[PDB]
């Protein structure tokens, strides 16, 4: 359809590549899902920059099938909280099933989500399951694409000194999509409450796998 | 459970938060999918650090359901290449369909994947659709979790001065999984050829949406 151009690349010496990759790992490794979020204001320009970063993600056939919905208004944050707490309660009681509920004991999560009120910003990431002269276009691998962008967003948040927890509000998508005025070709993928951690924020003492438990070399 | 411990955090002043996030956006915005990789060797230590970076991703219920399989052997890379080209060729002539094939024209991709040979490293990312001491265990949102890890990997590669292209070799999963001796609960998500760009690498002249085409602020 259009032209191709030389690729321009920044090369670092090997030593600098080691040190950069090291320190980026160290930076990302300090990231934890934080479920206790201060209501201190965050600068909107930072939120913008992290969403711009997420928007640099690759996507199947260059479709960029993502919408980041940002909610700061307290009335609206609280309506989102009412929906999530209602749905999550049924999820814990009924829909998740015993094994799932057991697998979550160690996180001490339940259906009470105070962070939906207290966090200064909520970011709801919607995938566009298809797109749109005004003709209908395929979104190839939209879920994976949008999840890659989420990864970039998480990295950008960590790099900027903000915290969050990646949530899936199971069975809340349609209610939240309707509430937020999103079109029917958007689904909710993930909800991220963003801000500074609370002073007494806590995290579960989880450990990550060692390198040789995640990387395999062949042949 | 699993005890719960205090969390702490490095905080930057607002002005540094702006700067850091501005800079990080510019760094990431320079990432392009590059389909012409140099055969020059890359430091294994960097490969490790990017994979470790990927391993810091959140995952549903702390399942860490990812395996990064790292191929450097010329014979194995070539076998990978044989499977993917044979399978992509059918994908282009018949399995994707006219519309998909049309949507790829602007990228000028075809079934020939010389990077599978020339790249010094391939990373194949497998999701673990469930896991196991010995008892079976349930990997919630494994696909999204591994794709988030992919996002971190891609960031880590850009940050490290390496390039790649995120690929999905349609209908190659089962043959790759078997070729690489991966167990039957692993399933290929994406393949990343890694290295420096060829001296004459080109990319399509694509534009990304402006901020107001991807970000919506909603109130009452
Ligand atoms: C999930 C998904 C699948 C992709 N599959 C292929 C592919 O199979 N072959 C390929 O050459 N590029 C593939 N790509 C890369 C996209 O075509 C590329 O990201 C897009 O054209 C935008 O280019 P950019 O990454 O430089 O921003 C894929 C990307 C995504 C995220
Ligand atoms: C796709 C996926 C879904 C997740 N869903 C939820 C969720 O609904 N609620 C929640 O509190 N955390 C969720 N998380 C956080 C995890 O429970 C998990 O323990 C955390 O990601 C692992 O700890 P860490 O992020 O601090 O490394 C999710 C993570 C992934 C990526
Ligand atoms: N997997 C094929 C086709 C392809 C290419 C680019 C792209 O964004 C997508 I979605 C598919 C290939 O590698 O050519
Ligand atoms: N969505 C529910 C339950 C939950 C919690 C953590 C987690 O990793 C997963 I997968 C699910 C909630 O937010 O509590």
């Amino acid at each position: 359809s259009v032209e191709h151009i030389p690729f321009s690349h920044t090369r670092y010496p090997e030593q600098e590549m080691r040190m950069r990759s090291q320190e980026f790992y160290e930076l990302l490794n300090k990231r934890r899902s934080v479920r206790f979020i201060s209501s201190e204001h965050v600068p909107m320009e930072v939120i913008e920059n992290v969403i711009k970063a997420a928007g640099t993600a690759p996507s199947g056939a260059h479709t960029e099938p993502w919408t980041f919905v940002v909610v700061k208004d307290p009335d609206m944050k609280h309506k989102i909280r009412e929906i999530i707490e209602e749905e999550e309660e049924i999820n814990y009681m009924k829909r998740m099933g015993k094994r799932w509920v057991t697998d979550l004991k160690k996180l001490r999560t339940n259906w009470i989500k105070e962070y939906l009120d207290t966090a200064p910003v909520l970011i709801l990431i919607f995938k566009q399951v298809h797109g749109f002269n005004g003709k209908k276009k395929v979104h190839y691998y939209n879920e994976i694409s949008v999840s890659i962008a989420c990864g970039l967003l998480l990295a950008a948040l960590q790099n900027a000194g903000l915290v969050t927890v990646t949530t899936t509000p199971l069975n809340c998508g349609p209610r939240l999509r309707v509430l937020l005025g999103r079109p029917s070709h958007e689904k909710l993928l993930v909800l991220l409450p963003v801000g500074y951690p609370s002073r007494d924020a806590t995290v579960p003492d989880l450990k990550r796998k060692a390198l040789d438990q995640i990387m395999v070399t062949v042949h």
Side-chain angles (χ1 to χ4, degrees), chain A residues 1-132 134-219:
Chain A
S1 288
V2 105
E3 275 215 30
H4 280 239
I5 53 162
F7 172 62
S8 59
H9 183 240
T10 305
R11 224 230 226 205
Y12 309 110
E14 288 190 0
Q15 198 36 237
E16 187 182 354
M17 300 166 63
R18 295 185 226 265
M19 284 303 324
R20 293 181 65 91
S21 62
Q22 255 261 73
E23 67 216 348
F24 190 60
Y25 158 64
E26 272 158 17
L27 186 282
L28 288 185
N29 194 52
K30 290 170 165 68
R31 186 207 63 72
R32 297 298 307 271
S33 296
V34 174
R35 301 181 174 90
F36 309 93
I37 287 147
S38 169
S39 59
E40 183 171 358
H41 82 264
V42 298
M44 203 54 220
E45 183 171 358
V46 168
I47 298 315
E48 287 172 3
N49 291 346
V50 309
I51 289 163
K52 299 212 285 170
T56 68
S59 66
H62 187 51
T63 44
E64 306 171 84
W66 41 63
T67 297
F68 305 82
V69 173
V70 173
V71 183
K72 297 171 298 186
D73 165 26
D75 160 302
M76 182 57 86
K77 297 184 303 186
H78 192 252
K79 286 167 156 132
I80 290 174
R81 176 170 189 198
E82 290 172 335
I83 291 160
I84 287 176
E85 292 196 341
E86 180 182 9
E87 299 300 341
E88 290 291 12
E89 181 165 4
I90 310 164
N91 293 337
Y92 276 86
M93 297 309 290
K94 171 204 182 192
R95 267 130 41 156
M96 289 165 102
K98 226 204 273 339
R99 157 109 38 71
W100 198 344
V101 165
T102 302
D103 289 340
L104 303 170
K105 296 309 196 164
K106 68 177 130 90
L107 311 184
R108 299 205 210 334
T109 46
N110 66 6
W111 57 90
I112 309 304
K113 309 297 193 192
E114 198 161 62
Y115 58 73
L116 294 169
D117 277 325
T118 65
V121 169
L122 309 173
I123 306 178
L124 286 89
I125 307 175
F126 289 86
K127 70 190 175 161
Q128 300 168 21
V129 298
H130 60 83
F132 287 102
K135 205 15 176 285
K136 192 240 182 58
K137 48 182 296 201
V138 187
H139 308 172
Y140 308 92
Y141 306 106
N142 57 80
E143 192 160 279
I144 299 162
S145 298
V146 181
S147 303
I148 288 168
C150 185
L152 301 195
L153 212 188
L154 290 163
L157 286 167
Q158 182 63 20
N159 181 68
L162 293 169
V163 299
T164 194
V165 50
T166 297
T167 71
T168 61
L170 208 223
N171 304 123
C172 299
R175 284 178 77 189
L176 290 165
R177 182 186 65 72
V178 169
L179 171 76
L180 273 357
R182 301 317 300 153
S184 63
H185 65 279
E186 284 183 8
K187 333 304 231 283
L188 182 56
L189 183 70
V190 124
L191 181 158
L192 275 42
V194 169
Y196 303 105
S198 279
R199 184 175 302 156
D200 53 342
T202 240
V203 289
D205 193 14
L206 304 168
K207 301 308 175 189
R208 283 165 182 150
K209 291 174 171 162
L211 183 54
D212 65 17
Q213 293 171 271
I214 73 178
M215 179 177 84
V216 180
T217 304
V218 214
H219 157 127

PDB file of all heavy atoms in Angstrom, chain A residues 2-22:
ATOM      1  N   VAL A   2       1.821   1.494   0.915  1.00  0.00           N
ATOM      2  CA  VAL A   2       2.855   2.594   0.757  1.00  0.00           C
ATOM      3  C   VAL A   2       4.388   2.230   0.901  1.00  0.00           C
ATOM      4  O   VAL A   2       4.776   1.063   0.835  1.00  0.00           O
ATOM      5  CB  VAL A   2       2.423   4.026   1.364  1.00  0.00           C
ATOM      6  CG1 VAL A   2       3.156   4.371   2.710  1.00  0.00           C
ATOM      7  CG2 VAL A   2       2.555   5.149   0.277  1.00  0.00           C
ATOM      8  N   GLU A   3       5.245   3.244   1.016  1.00  0.00           N
ATOM      9  CA  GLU A   3       6.685   3.043   0.858  1.00  0.00           C
ATOM     10  C   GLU A   3       7.417   2.453   2.059  1.00  0.00           C
ATOM     11  O   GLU A   3       6.859   2.349   3.161  1.00  0.00           O
ATOM     12  CB  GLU A   3       7.351   4.306   0.358  1.00  0.00           C
ATOM     13  CG  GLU A   3       7.320   4.456  -1.163  1.00  0.00           C
ATOM     14  CD  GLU A   3       8.593   5.135  -1.700  1.00  0.00           C
ATOM     15  OE1 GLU A   3       9.646   4.954  -1.044  1.00  0.00           O
ATOM     16  OE2 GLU A   3       8.556   5.842  -2.759  1.00  0.00           O
ATOM     17  N   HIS A   4       8.636   1.990   1.828  1.00  0.00           N
ATOM     18  CA  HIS A   4       9.425   1.347   2.867  1.00  0.00           C
ATOM     19  C   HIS A   4      10.653   2.205   2.987  1.00  0.00           C
ATOM     20  O   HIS A   4      11.034   2.809   2.033  1.00  0.00           O
ATOM     21  CB  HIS A   4       9.736  -0.100   2.497  1.00  0.00           C
ATOM     22  CG  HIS A   4       8.583  -1.036   2.759  1.00  0.00           C
ATOM     23  ND1 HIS A   4       8.666  -2.131   3.610  1.00  0.00           N
ATOM     24  CD2 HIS A   4       7.297  -1.012   2.313  1.00  0.00           C
ATOM     25  CE1 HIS A   4       7.500  -2.758   3.640  1.00  0.00           C
ATOM     26  NE2 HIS A   4       6.652  -2.097   2.864  1.00  0.00           N
ATOM     27  N   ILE A   5      11.226   2.337   4.164  1.00  0.00           N
ATOM     28  CA  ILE A   5      12.265   3.317   4.382  1.00  0.00           C
ATOM     29  C   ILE A   5      13.397   2.581   5.119  1.00  0.00           C
ATOM     30  O   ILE A   5      13.154   1.535   5.713  1.00  0.00           O
ATOM     31  CB  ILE A   5      11.733   4.489   5.247  1.00  0.00           C
ATOM     32  CG1 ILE A   5      11.101   3.934   6.520  1.00  0.00           C
ATOM     33  CG2 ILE A   5      10.708   5.312   4.486  1.00  0.00           C
ATOM     34  CD1 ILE A   5      10.932   4.925   7.609  1.00  0.00           C
ATOM     35  N   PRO A   6      14.640   3.080   5.023  1.00  0.00           N
ATOM     36  CA  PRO A   6      15.731   2.491   5.829  1.00  0.00           C
ATOM     37  C   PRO A   6      15.375   2.451   7.296  1.00  0.00           C
ATOM     38  O   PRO A   6      14.676   3.337   7.794  1.00  0.00           O
ATOM     39  CB  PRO A   6      16.904   3.448   5.593  1.00  0.00           C
ATOM     40  CG  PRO A   6      16.645   3.977   4.168  1.00  0.00           C
ATOM     41  CD  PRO A   6      15.134   4.120   4.084  1.00  0.00           C
ATOM     42  N   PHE A   7      15.803   1.404   7.982  1.00  0.00           N
ATOM     43  CA  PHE A   7      15.584   1.343   9.398  1.00  0.00           C
ATOM     44  C   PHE A   7      16.733   2.061  10.081  1.00  0.00           C
ATOM     45  O   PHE A   7      17.880   1.911   9.687  1.00  0.00           O
ATOM     46  CB  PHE A   7      15.508  -0.094   9.874  1.00  0.00           C
ATOM     47  CG  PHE A   7      15.467  -0.227  11.372  1.00  0.00           C
ATOM     48  CD1 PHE A   7      14.408   0.314  12.105  1.00  0.00           C
ATOM     49  CD2 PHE A   7      16.485  -0.905  12.058  1.00  0.00           C
ATOM     50  CE1 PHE A   7      14.349   0.177  13.492  1.00  0.00           C
ATOM     51  CE2 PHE A   7      16.433  -1.043  13.449  1.00  0.00           C
ATOM     52  CZ  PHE A   7      15.352  -0.479  14.163  1.00  0.00           C
ATOM     53  N   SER A   8      16.439   2.840  11.117  1.00  0.00           N
ATOM     54  CA  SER A   8      17.539   3.514  11.812  1.00  0.00           C
ATOM     55  C   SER A   8      17.565   3.011  13.222  1.00  0.00           C
ATOM     56  O   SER A   8      16.542   2.975  13.940  1.00  0.00           O
ATOM     57  CB  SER A   8      17.383   5.035  11.808  1.00  0.00           C
ATOM     58  OG  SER A   8      16.157   5.326  12.447  1.00  0.00           O
ATOM     59  N   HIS A   9      18.769   2.643  13.603  1.00  0.00           N
ATOM     60  CA  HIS A   9      18.981   1.882  14.788  1.00  0.00           C
ATOM     61  C   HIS A   9      20.010   2.567  15.688  1.00  0.00           C
ATOM     62  O   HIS A   9      21.017   3.053  15.190  1.00  0.00           O
ATOM     63  CB  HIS A   9      19.522   0.529  14.355  1.00  0.00           C
ATOM     64  CG  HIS A   9      19.726  -0.402  15.495  1.00  0.00           C
ATOM     65  ND1 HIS A   9      20.955  -0.942  15.803  1.00  0.00           N
ATOM     66  CD2 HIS A   9      18.869  -0.829  16.446  1.00  0.00           C
ATOM     67  CE1 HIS A   9      20.833  -1.703  16.873  1.00  0.00           C
ATOM     68  NE2 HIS A   9      19.578  -1.654  17.281  1.00  0.00           N
ATOM     69  N   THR A  10      19.791   2.567  16.999  1.00  0.00           N
ATOM     70  CA  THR A  10      20.853   2.962  17.940  1.00  0.00           C
ATOM     71  C   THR A  10      21.603   1.721  18.440  1.00  0.00           C
ATOM     72  O   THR A  10      21.005   0.915  19.158  1.00  0.00           O
ATOM     73  CB  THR A  10      20.248   3.733  19.193  1.00  0.00           C
ATOM     74  OG1 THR A  10      19.470   4.840  18.732  1.00  0.00           O
ATOM     75  CG2 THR A  10      21.366   4.256  20.149  1.00  0.00           C
ATOM     76  N   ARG A  11      22.872   1.562  18.054  1.00  0.00           N
ATOM     77  CA  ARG A  11      23.698   0.469  18.561  1.00  0.00           C
ATOM     78  C   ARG A  11      24.486   0.887  19.796  1.00  0.00           C
ATOM     79  O   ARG A  11      25.114   1.955  19.794  1.00  0.00           O
ATOM     80  CB  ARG A  11      24.723   0.033  17.515  1.00  0.00           C
ATOM     81  CG  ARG A  11      24.824  -1.432  17.406  1.00  0.00           C
ATOM     82  CD  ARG A  11      26.184  -2.005  17.470  1.00  0.00           C
ATOM     83  NE  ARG A  11      26.197  -2.941  16.368  1.00  0.00           N
ATOM     84  CZ  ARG A  11      26.959  -4.024  16.223  1.00  0.00           C
ATOM     85  NH1 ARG A  11      27.866  -4.416  17.112  1.00  0.00           N
ATOM     86  NH2 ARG A  11      26.761  -4.742  15.133  1.00  0.00           N
ATOM     87  N   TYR A  12      24.490   0.059  20.835  1.00  0.00           N
ATOM     88  CA  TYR A  12      25.370   0.321  21.987  1.00  0.00           C
ATOM     89  C   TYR A  12      26.512  -0.664  21.953  1.00  0.00           C
ATOM     90  O   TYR A  12      26.306  -1.804  21.498  1.00  0.00           O
ATOM     91  CB  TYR A  12      24.618   0.130  23.309  1.00  0.00           C
ATOM     92  CG  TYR A  12      23.291   0.859  23.421  1.00  0.00           C
ATOM     93  CD1 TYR A  12      22.082   0.133  23.415  1.00  0.00           C
ATOM     94  CD2 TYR A  12      23.235   2.281  23.551  1.00  0.00           C
ATOM     95  CE1 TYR A  12      20.846   0.773  23.515  1.00  0.00           C
ATOM     96  CE2 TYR A  12      22.004   2.946  23.660  1.00  0.00           C
ATOM     97  CZ  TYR A  12      20.807   2.169  23.641  1.00  0.00           C
ATOM     98  OH  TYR A  12      19.565   2.765  23.747  1.00  0.00           O
ATOM     99  N   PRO A  13      27.718  -0.267  22.465  1.00  0.00           N
ATOM    100  CA  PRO A  13      28.801  -1.299  22.610  1.00  0.00           C
ATOM    101  C   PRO A  13      28.325  -2.464  23.503  1.00  0.00           C
ATOM    102  O   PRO A  13      27.445  -2.280  24.328  1.00  0.00           O
ATOM    103  CB  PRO A  13      29.992  -0.531  23.257  1.00  0.00           C
ATOM    104  CG  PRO A  13      29.717   0.921  23.028  1.00  0.00           C
ATOM    105  CD  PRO A  13      28.175   1.073  22.904  1.00  0.00           C
ATOM    106  N   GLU A  14      28.882  -3.654  23.318  1.00  0.00           N
ATOM    107  CA  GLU A  14      28.457  -4.817  24.082  1.00  0.00           C
ATOM    108  C   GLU A  14      28.358  -4.573  25.591  1.00  0.00           C
ATOM    109  O   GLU A  14      27.354  -4.930  26.234  1.00  0.00           O
ATOM    110  CB  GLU A  14      29.386  -5.971  23.815  1.00  0.00           C
ATOM    111  CG  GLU A  14      29.230  -6.576  22.469  1.00  0.00           C
ATOM    112  CD  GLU A  14      30.024  -7.864  22.390  1.00  0.00           C
ATOM    113  OE1 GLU A  14      30.670  -8.225  23.407  1.00  0.00           O
ATOM    114  OE2 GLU A  14      30.021  -8.534  21.334  1.00  0.00           O
ATOM    115  N   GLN A  15      29.394  -3.950  26.143  1.00  0.00           N
ATOM    116  CA  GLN A  15      29.454  -3.629  27.570  1.00  0.00           C
ATOM    117  C   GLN A  15      28.248  -2.805  28.045  1.00  0.00           C
ATOM    118  O   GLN A  15      27.609  -3.098  29.062  1.00  0.00           O
ATOM    119  CB  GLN A  15      30.764  -2.885  27.855  1.00  0.00           C
ATOM    120  CG  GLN A  15      31.180  -2.867  29.315  1.00  0.00           C
ATOM    121  CD  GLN A  15      30.823  -4.177  30.048  1.00  0.00           C
ATOM    122  OE1 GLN A  15      30.103  -4.141  31.064  1.00  0.00           O
ATOM    123  NE2 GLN A  15      31.290  -5.338  29.522  1.00  0.00           N
ATOM    124  N   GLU A  16      27.955  -1.758  27.297  1.00  0.00           N
ATOM    125  CA  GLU A  16      26.814  -0.958  27.575  1.00  0.00           C
ATOM    126  C   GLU A  16      25.505  -1.780  27.393  1.00  0.00           C
ATOM    127  O   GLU A  16      24.531  -1.528  28.125  1.00  0.00           O
ATOM    128  CB  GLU A  16      26.840   0.310  26.715  1.00  0.00           C
ATOM    129  CG  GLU A  16      25.737   1.326  27.069  1.00  0.00           C
ATOM    130  CD  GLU A  16      25.712   2.578  26.191  1.00  0.00           C
ATOM    131  OE1 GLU A  16      26.611   2.787  25.335  1.00  0.00           O
ATOM    132  OE2 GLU A  16      24.760   3.375  26.364  1.00  0.00           O
ATOM    133  N   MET A  17      25.475  -2.748  26.456  1.00  0.00           N
ATOM    134  CA  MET A  17      24.279  -3.556  26.301  1.00  0.00           C
ATOM    135  C   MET A  17      24.070  -4.445  27.529  1.00  0.00           C
ATOM    136  O   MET A  17      22.939  -4.585  27.986  1.00  0.00           O
ATOM    137  CB  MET A  17      24.271  -4.401  25.038  1.00  0.00           C
ATOM    138  CG  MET A  17      24.352  -3.651  23.741  1.00  0.00           C
ATOM    139  SD  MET A  17      24.742  -4.775  22.355  1.00  0.00           S
ATOM    140  CE  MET A  17      23.301  -5.874  22.325  1.00  0.00           C
ATOM    141  N   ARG A  18      25.149  -5.033  28.053  1.00  0.00           N
ATOM    142  CA  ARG A  18      25.084  -5.791  29.302  1.00  0.00           C
ATOM    143  C   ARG A  18      24.572  -4.938  30.444  1.00  0.00           C
ATOM    144  O   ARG A  18      23.648  -5.343  31.163  1.00  0.00           O
ATOM    145  CB  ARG A  18      26.446  -6.357  29.713  1.00  0.00           C
ATOM    146  CG  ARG A  18      27.002  -7.406  28.734  1.00  0.00           C
ATOM    147  CD  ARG A  18      28.297  -8.043  29.247  1.00  0.00           C
ATOM    148  NE  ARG A  18      29.267  -8.086  28.168  1.00  0.00           N
ATOM    149  CZ  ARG A  18      29.471  -9.137  27.378  1.00  0.00           C
ATOM    150  NH1 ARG A  18      28.789 -10.262  27.577  1.00  0.00           N
ATOM    151  NH2 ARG A  18      30.351  -9.064  26.382  1.00  0.00           N
ATOM    152  N   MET A  19      25.153  -3.759  30.622  1.00  0.00           N
ATOM    153  CA  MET A  19      24.780  -2.939  31.767  1.00  0.00           C
ATOM    154  C   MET A  19      23.333  -2.427  31.673  1.00  0.00           C
ATOM    155  O   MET A  19      22.594  -2.479  32.653  1.00  0.00           O
ATOM    156  CB  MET A  19      25.789  -1.823  31.976  1.00  0.00           C
ATOM    157  CG  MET A  19      27.117  -2.286  32.609  1.00  0.00           C
ATOM    158  SD  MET A  19      27.019  -3.145  34.231  1.00  0.00           S
ATOM    159  CE  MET A  19      25.650  -2.334  35.144  1.00  0.00           C
ATOM    160  N   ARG A  20      22.921  -1.969  30.494  1.00  0.00           N
ATOM    161  CA  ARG A  20      21.526  -1.554  30.269  1.00  0.00           C
ATOM    162  C   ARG A  20      20.510  -2.653  30.542  1.00  0.00           C
ATOM    163  O   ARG A  20      19.464  -2.401  31.174  1.00  0.00           O
ATOM    164  CB  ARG A  20      21.309  -1.001  28.851  1.00  0.00           C
ATOM    165  CG  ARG A  20      22.027   0.329  28.568  1.00  0.00           C
ATOM    166  CD  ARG A  20      21.725   0.816  27.148  1.00  0.00           C
ATOM    167  NE  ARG A  20      20.304   1.117  27.071  1.00  0.00           N
ATOM    168  CZ  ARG A  20      19.803   2.314  27.318  1.00  0.00           C
ATOM    169  NH1 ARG A  20      20.619   3.331  27.585  1.00  0.00           N
ATOM    170  NH2 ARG A  20      18.498   2.507  27.280  1.00  0.00           N
ATOM    171  N   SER A  21      20.813  -3.853  30.052  1.00  0.00           N
ATOM    172  CA  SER A  21      19.878  -4.984  30.152  1.00  0.00           C
ATOM    173  C   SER A  21      19.799  -5.471  31.587  1.00  0.00           C
ATOM    174  O   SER A  21      18.741  -5.844  32.081  1.00  0.00           O
ATOM    175  CB  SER A  21      20.256  -6.104  29.173  1.00  0.00           C
ATOM    176  OG  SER A  21      21.523  -6.617  29.466  1.00  0.00           O
ATOM    177  N   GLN A  22      20.926  -5.417  32.264  1.00  0.00           N
ATOM    178  CA  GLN A  22      20.983  -5.657  33.676  1.00  0.00           C
ATOM    179  C   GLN A  22      20.144  -4.714  34.483  1.00  0.00           C
ATOM    180  O   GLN A  22      19.394  -5.145  35.391  1.00  0.00           O
ATOM    181  CB  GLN A  22      22.370  -5.354  34.125  1.00  0.00           C
ATOM    182  CG  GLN A  22      23.108  -6.531  34.396  1.00  0.00           C
ATOM    183  CD  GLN A  22      23.091  -6.781  35.832  1.00  0.00           C
ATOM    184  OE1 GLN A  22      22.053  -7.186  36.391  1.00  0.00           O
ATOM    185  NE2 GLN A  22      24.247  -6.528  36.486  1.00  0.00           N
TER     186      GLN A  22
END
